[PDB]
Amino acid sequence: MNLNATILGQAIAFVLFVLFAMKYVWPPLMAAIEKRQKEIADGLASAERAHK
Amino acid sequence: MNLNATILGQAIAFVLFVLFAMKYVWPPLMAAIEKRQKEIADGLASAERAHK
Amino acid sequence: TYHLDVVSAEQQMFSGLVEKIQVTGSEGELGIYPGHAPLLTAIKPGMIRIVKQHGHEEFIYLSGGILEVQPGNVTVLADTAIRGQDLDEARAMEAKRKAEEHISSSHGDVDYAQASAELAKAIAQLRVIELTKK
Amino acid sequence: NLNMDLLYMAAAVMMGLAAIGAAIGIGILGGKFLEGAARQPDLIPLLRTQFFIVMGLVDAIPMIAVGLGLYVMFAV
Amino acid sequence: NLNMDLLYMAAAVMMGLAAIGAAIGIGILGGKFLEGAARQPDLIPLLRTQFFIVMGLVDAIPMIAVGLGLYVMFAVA
Amino acid sequence: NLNMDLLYMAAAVMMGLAAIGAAIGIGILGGKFLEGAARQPDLIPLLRTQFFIVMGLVDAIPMIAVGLGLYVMFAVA
Amino acid sequence: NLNMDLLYMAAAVMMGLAAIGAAIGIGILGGKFLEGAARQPDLIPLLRTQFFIVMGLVDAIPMIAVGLGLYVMFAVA
Amino acid sequence: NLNMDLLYMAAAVMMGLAAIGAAIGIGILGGKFLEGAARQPDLIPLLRTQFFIVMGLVDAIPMIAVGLGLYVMFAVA
Amino acid sequence: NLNMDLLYMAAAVMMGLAAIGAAIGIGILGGKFLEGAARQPDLIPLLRTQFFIVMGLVDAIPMIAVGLGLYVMFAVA
Amino acid sequence: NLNMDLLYMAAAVMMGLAAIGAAIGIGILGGKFLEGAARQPDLIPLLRTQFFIVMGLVDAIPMIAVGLGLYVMFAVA
Amino acid sequence: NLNMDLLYMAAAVMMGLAAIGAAIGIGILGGKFLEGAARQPDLIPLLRTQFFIVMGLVDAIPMIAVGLGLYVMFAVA
Amino acid sequence: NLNMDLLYMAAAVMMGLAAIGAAIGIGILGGKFLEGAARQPDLIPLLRTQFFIVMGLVDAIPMIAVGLGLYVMFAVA
Amino acid sequence: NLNMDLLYMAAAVMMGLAAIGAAIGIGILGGKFLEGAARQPDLIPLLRTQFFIVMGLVDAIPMIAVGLGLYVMFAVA
Amino acid sequence: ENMTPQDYIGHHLNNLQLDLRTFASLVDPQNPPAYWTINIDSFMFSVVLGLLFLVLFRSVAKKATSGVPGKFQTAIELVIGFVNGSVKDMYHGKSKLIAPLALTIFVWVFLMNLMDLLPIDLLPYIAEHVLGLPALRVVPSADVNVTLSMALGVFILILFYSIKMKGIGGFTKELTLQPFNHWAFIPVNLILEGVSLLSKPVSLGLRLFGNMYAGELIFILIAGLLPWWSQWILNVPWAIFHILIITLQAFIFMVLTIVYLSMASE
């Protein structure tokens, strides 16, 4: 079919989109989930210490 | 064969597809949102009671 | 119709005439009906439903045992079994608490051989307690 | 001439392959229907209803083949 | 001429495939019937009625094939 | 001339496909009949009755194939 | 005339092989569906959903063959 | 005279398909015979009787296929 | 004209083989998935995940065949 | 040229189909033999004596096909 | 001349058969994978590695056939 | 020139059919071997001896088929 | 024409049937490998060594065909 | 007006090819052998949809809050969690590259597939008459260029981890010694390894390509063959089925990428 220089342009485009997601998108996301988990587990700890 | 006719037929097909999608895919979509909301809310309320 | 009997190995759980049932088995839960087959084996932690004359049911916890199936009068031999209103939702929730702790407190295969059974017993209680509300 | 006997041959091919398809499909499907019904003779009507449904599916493609084979034998 | 030489071939292939399909289909169905009956013979007449009910649809298509094969062999010739 | 070559080939295809069909069908049916006979002996005559009833239907189409193959071989060519 | 009498054979083979493939694939799959529906009738709707999902997977490639068959039937002749 | 060379091919197809049918059928049948012998070793001279009763039906069509193919190869050719 | 004509049949055979391979493979795989779903109703979201895992690999090669068949019929024609 | 060539082709089809028949039949039969050996190992010297009896019948009909194949190649040339 | 389309026919047949083999082999293998995963759901990460191991052996000859078919399709033809 | 150029095709048919027969026969036989090794693991060095006993009988016919194919390619053609 | 295209066709037949045989044989064998690994999760090293032993013999006879097909495409043609 | 089914199919099977040797538009009956002839239409669609992925994810990532999320932020965190869970199932190393790689693959492939749901003549018509372009087609993932480009990037990434610790250690030791530590099975098992290894990425490419290529084809066939009053009843079911197809293909391309790299490192 039409194997084209488009394939190489799109390889560079693939790695560029990977880089954009790698630098800007993904790094800022991790913290929220851990904070929300922490504020639920500490309550179970508090109940245990009340009983103790 | 007329091409205006083909466009008309494609239009009818697209309308029927869109209506089907709106009436079987979108009604149950928000289930995950509700799951996360309810789980988080119950956990945090129980932790509040644990602190007091 | 047909007759059924249940024992908890240190207590009698049921005895009387019955129409149809639903029970657990060697691998999982199973939809039972009268007149289908002639052979028998073991039970995984589960429960049983007893629909009697005029269509009245009851719901019993089965912690483990063996099931006859083949005869007109059938019976369940259970190493431990509890009546559906001797147990309660609070008791099954305590079992849930125990099992969810033991999952966190079991770390090897040898001890998980017991932790898994404890979890299965808790889950069986949690299904029978919901079926009890019918 | 040479045209029409080859058309008969092509019709033979489609409609014999469709014969294989439908026959073996219903054979397998009804084999499980009968063993399940032998295990559950009280539920024969229920499983037979299911059997109509999955019969529709199993012969969906086969009936497409068979109809188009009719077009090759009788519609040309 | 060449017509009859190819038409006998066409009827042959159609009816051969029809034969294979019908025979092996009923083979599969009947095996499960016999095993289940061996476990509990009280169901034999019942399951044999079910057996004909299903075997009709098994023979549905292959007899279209056989009818058209006989037609090609004796009427198109 | 050109007739007998293709007519023998047609009969050959017909009876070869019939030989596949009948053999495989009776293979499946008889295999389940034998595991039933091993499961419950002293029901061998009853299961053999059912076995012949089903075998009669299994060999239906293949025997038509065999008959018309013999017809093509020893009547048409 | 000379050109067209091979194109319908091409289409014929496409659709026949695809039809057998899809038919027996759905046969295996739906046979397992009914086997499963024999244990717990209560799960018959849930398993019916699973069955149509996997069945949608099964017919994928055969549908491509069927579509090109229709293309040949109504545009290539 | 080209007539001979197709007749050998026509005998070959018959005997090849007969070999496949009559080998795989007896394979499937005798396998169940051997598992029956494995369960009930004191019944073996009974299941041999049943096995030879059924094997003669498995070899009904294939031995005709071999007979007529071996006829075509020598008498006709 | 034969250069144009024969690639229709070549693409036809590629796509027929692809259809049978894909359909039967998915049939077997999904049938095991359905029985597994039947015994343990709780593990359907797990067995479904592993089912898609394995299905990707099963359909890897049939996609090769069917894509190249489309290529043959439309690109070189 | 093409008489002596097609004789070799006929022998090829004959012996190939015979090979399939013999191989698959003994594969099934010996698989059941091994299961019987696994379930009751001290009983192997009896089941093997039954195996060779059944195996003789299984290969009896493939082997005359093989014999005629070598006859076609070497004797008829 | 016809060498181009004959070479595509050869490559087409080889690659379609490769698709058959790979699809059904991985189907059987992954079906047993899922049957094992349903029974011991805590051993999915281990069975899913053994599946890599034997799946790598399954596809070897089919992948070689696909590569050589591409060679004939694009380098030779 | 076509006379030997088709002898290569004849050998292809012969030893390819031999290949599929031998491969599938050993596959079934070894499948029962491994299941036996799983049921009685302390028994492997006995059942493997039996496996090598019967695998020679399985390959007896395909090996001579392959040898004659190699002879046809390298000696005759 | 007739010299090279027939050699590519012969190699296609050889390596396609080799693909079928090797892939499906190893599929059947590895299925039992994984079933045994599901029943005896402490025996996987032992059963995989047995699997290597059987796998070598399964692959051996197709590999002659694969190498010889490479010979035909690259040395003869 | 010379419209026929085959002519219509011919128009729809053509890209907007632009030859960079003279920077001129290549009309459909005019196809050169040169390499630098980049296709405008599907390539533009591809990069635009990738940018759409990045733009939406950045317009949420620059604000995302840890309270009860908004109704738009929740969808993006759901896809984030889906990708994170899929990677975490199949990977134990500490490299942060796997996760954004999988996320981009999933969403970009999904959007490019989603283009296949559109009416086949809408955008190509607007391209031909409003603008004047000779041809257009709307599905980037229905191209060998897109699919094998992504697959080739994945191949580079395969050899990356295979040549890190594995490369100095395992890759050499494994290729020379394992499985049977013999001199004659080094070449044979290298042949097996070579064909298997190279088929791993190419299969990703051709799998996704085949599905999208054939779906676009099915829409084209329905539009080209059947009269307008009958097209709808066969066009709608295919669209419903193709929703499932596109979701599964995005998922599978992602998943197999993760498995390959995970086995390369661990």
Numbering used by the authors:
A (entry chain X), B (entry chain Y): 1 to 52
C (entry chain H): 3 to 136
D (entry chain R): 3 to 78
E (entry chain M), F (entry chain J), G (entry chain S), H (entry chain L), I (entry chain N), J (entry chain Q), ...: 3 to 79
N (entry chain a): 4 to 269
From the paper:
A key component in the generation of cellular energy is the F1Fo ATP synthase, a biological rotary motor that converts proton motive force (pmf) to adenosine tri-phosphate (ATP) in both oxidative phosphorylation and photophosphorylation. The enzyme is based on two rotary motors, termed F1 and Fo, that are coupled together by two stalks: a central rotor stalk and a peripheral stator stalk. The central stalk is comprised of subunits ε and γ and rotates during the enzyme’s catalytic cycle.
Here we present cryo-EM data showing E. coli F1Fo ATP synthase in different rotational and inhibited sub-states, observed following incubation with 10 mM MgATP. Masked 3D classification focusing on the central rotor highlighted sub-states in which the εCTD adopted either a condensed down conformation or an extended half-up conformation. The maps generated for each of these sub-states showed the position of the εCTD, with local resolution estimates of 4–5 Å. To obtain clearer information in this region, a refinement that focused on the Fo motor was performed and produced maps of sufficient detail to enable fitting of the membrane region. Strikingly, the improved detail in this study shows that the transition of the εCTD to a down sub-state is associated with a substantial torsional flexing of the central stalk, as evident by rotation of the εNTD about the γ subunit. When the εCTD is in the down conformation, the central stalk is no longer stabilized by the εCTH1:γ interaction, likely increasing its torsional freedom, and the εNTD rotates relative to the γ subunit. When the εCTD subunit is in the down conformation, εCTH1 can no longer bridge between the εNTD and the γ subunit, thereby enabling the complex to open up to an unclamped conformation and allow a greater degree of flexible coupling between the F1 and Fo motors.
